[PDB]
Design a protein around this ligand. Structure first.
Ligand SMILES: [C]OC1=[C]C(C(=O)O[C][C][C]N2[C][C][C]N([C][C][C]OC(=O)C3=[C]C(O[C])=C(O[C])C(O[C]C4=[C][C]=C(N([O])=O)[C]=[C]4)=[C]3)[C][C]2)=[C]C(O[C])=C1O[C]
Ligand SMILES: CCCCCCCC/C=C\CCCCCCCC(=O)OC[C@H](O)CO
Ligand SMILES: CCCCCCCC/C=C\CCCCCCCC(=O)OC[C@H](O)CO
Ligand SMILES: CCCCCCCC/C=C\CCCCCCCC(=O)OC[C@H](O)CO
Ligand SMILES: CCCCCCCC/C=C\CCCCCCCC(=O)OC[C@H](O)CO
Length: 385
């Protein structure tokens, strides 16, 4: 029970990074997908790309985390993890190739949406299998995955900012995104392959030798994490990206305000929140404070909705100064990452070892369910207003 050189922990960190960095990079290239559609089309495809991507992403993600939650035992973990990684690698490679070939708007749209469905279908399997596997190890090792995911968001924000500041065409920035993701997926595979020869890994993984009952034991953390991401995705990014500066001195702020004050703030403090859990896990797996703080986050809905959103037609700006928005985004993002990591770490520990794997898989589904519910609410809000 001694992780020498913290090798297994570092590999779990890299697994987390490898799970989300590609997808995150994909999301950050939305400007490339919509702009490409605009320069190609001669109700529009770019006007619907975001919403159709949300559907092509959240439906497969939710379906396959569900199926994995009750079918993971039938497929070896090495197959589920390494096959999902190789599939995603192949998809992102193709995504990079399409940047350099000429294609009409509608085929590009359709093919990109197909690739999005695959990314999130194999992603679901890969994410559900990783949290299941981490369910056999101490809680710190689920925090490793969460922390590595947080780093994936931070890197995505650095990449977005650097891309704007470079002055390069959106297509070549996006080609860099996709090639980077391919390299990261290859590094993730290598790291995963190094686990079986580590004694610490075999110690907890040798523990392999009633879904309704398991769900009853983790229901508090499962619904908590679902509510975490319902709130988060209900406000971020679709709603928060519409905030405008009120103290800008220069027109140069315009193209940077959102990627800095919204995306960077979020991914910095969400990453840090997830990272703190590997060393500090208050309030504890049995404390009723964790669901209570998850509930209290509901305050951010009015708070952020009453920030300086422009154009606005129905609500008033109660918090106009950027400092309000950045402060709310930091707290909004820190509570998300910190409480989400706690729920994912503790969930598997509410159950016996021979069920921790399944518990982790279920926790993954509820996380994704949160995401899907968030996407719905934001849409329903925008569809009514
Ligand atoms: C939010 O975000 C973001 C974004 C950005 C941008 O650009 O916008 C654009 C995009 C748009 N959209 C699209 C999509 C949709 N939606 C909703 C949702 C959001 O959410 C998300 O998706 C998530 C989550 C999360 O958790 C964090 C997750 O996990 C749990 C997820 O799953 C998936 C996967 C997994 C795995 C994989 N494998 O493994 O492979 C793959 C894949 C997801 C919305 C919309 C930017 C940024 O920065 C840079 C950010 O941040 C990072
Ligand atoms: C597109 C690239 C996908 C590769 C996935 C690799 C194929 C996975 C092969 C399945 C192996 C398997 O599932 O066998 C386990 C068990 O023996 C059966 O019950
Ligand atoms: C699709 C291409 C990859 C398929 C993965 C097939 C399974 C890969 C198995 C790799 C061996 C492994 O890493 O795990 C077993 C280890 O030797 C003992 O714990
Ligand atoms: C905690 C950070 C809250 C910032 C408070 C703030 O920005 O208010 C300043 C005022 O609006 C200046 O006109
Ligand atoms: C904490 C920041 C609270 C500062 C809010 C009050 C500052 C008033 C102001 O206008 O400052 C501009 C801004 O701080 C840029 O210099």
């Amino acid at each position: 029970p001694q992780d020498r050189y913290k090798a297994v922990w570092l590999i779990f960190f890299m697994l987390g990074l490898g799970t989300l960095l590609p997808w995150n990079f994909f999301m950050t290239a939305t400007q490339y997908f919509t702009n490409r559609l605009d320069m190609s089309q001669n109700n529009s495809l770019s006007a619907i790309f975001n919403n159709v991507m949300t559907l092509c992403a959240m439906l497969p993600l939710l379906l396959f985390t569900y199926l994995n939650s009750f079918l993971h035992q039938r497929i070896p973990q090495s197959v589920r993890i390494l096959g999902s990684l190789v599939a995603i690698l192949l998809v992102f490679l193709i995504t990079a190739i399409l940047v350099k070939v000429q294609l009409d708007a509608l085929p590009f749209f359709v093919i990109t949406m197909i690739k999005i469905v695959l990314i999130n279908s194999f992603g679901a399997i890969l994410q559900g299998s990783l949290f299941g596997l981490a369910g056999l190890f101490p809680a710190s090792y689920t925090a490793a995955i969460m922390s590595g995911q947080g780093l994936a968001g931070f890197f995505a924000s650095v990449a977005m900012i650097c891309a704007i500041a470079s002055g390069s065409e959106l297509s070549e920035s996006a080609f860099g995104y996709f090639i980077t993701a391919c390299a990261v997926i290859i590094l993730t595979i290598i790291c995963y392959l190094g686990l079986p020869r580590l004694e610490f890994y075999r110690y907890y993984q040798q523990l392999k030798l009633s879904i309704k009952a398991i769900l009853k034991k983790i229901s508090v953390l499962a619904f908590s994490v679902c509510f975490i991401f319902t709130i988060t995705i209900g406000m971020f990014p679709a709603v928060t990206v519409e905030v405008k500066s009120s103290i800008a001195g220069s027109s140069t702020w315009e193209r940077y305000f959102i990627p800095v004050s919204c995306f960077l703030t979020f991914n910095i403090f969400d990453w840090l929140g997830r990272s703190l859990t590997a060393v500090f896990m208050w309030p504890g797996k049995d404390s009723r404070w964790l669901p209570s703080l998850v509930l209290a986050r509901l305050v951010f809905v009015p708070l952020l909705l009453l920030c300086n959103i422009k154009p606005r037609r129905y609500l008033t700006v109660v918090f106009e100064h950027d400092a309000w928005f950045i402060f709310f985004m930091a707290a909004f993002a820190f509570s998300n990452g910190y409480l989400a990591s706690l729920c994912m770490c503790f969930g598997p520990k509410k159950v016996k070892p021979a069920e921790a794997e399944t518990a982790g898989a279920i926790m993954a589904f509820f996380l994704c369910l949160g995401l899907a519910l968030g996407a719905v609410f934001s849409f329903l809000f925008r569809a009514i207003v």
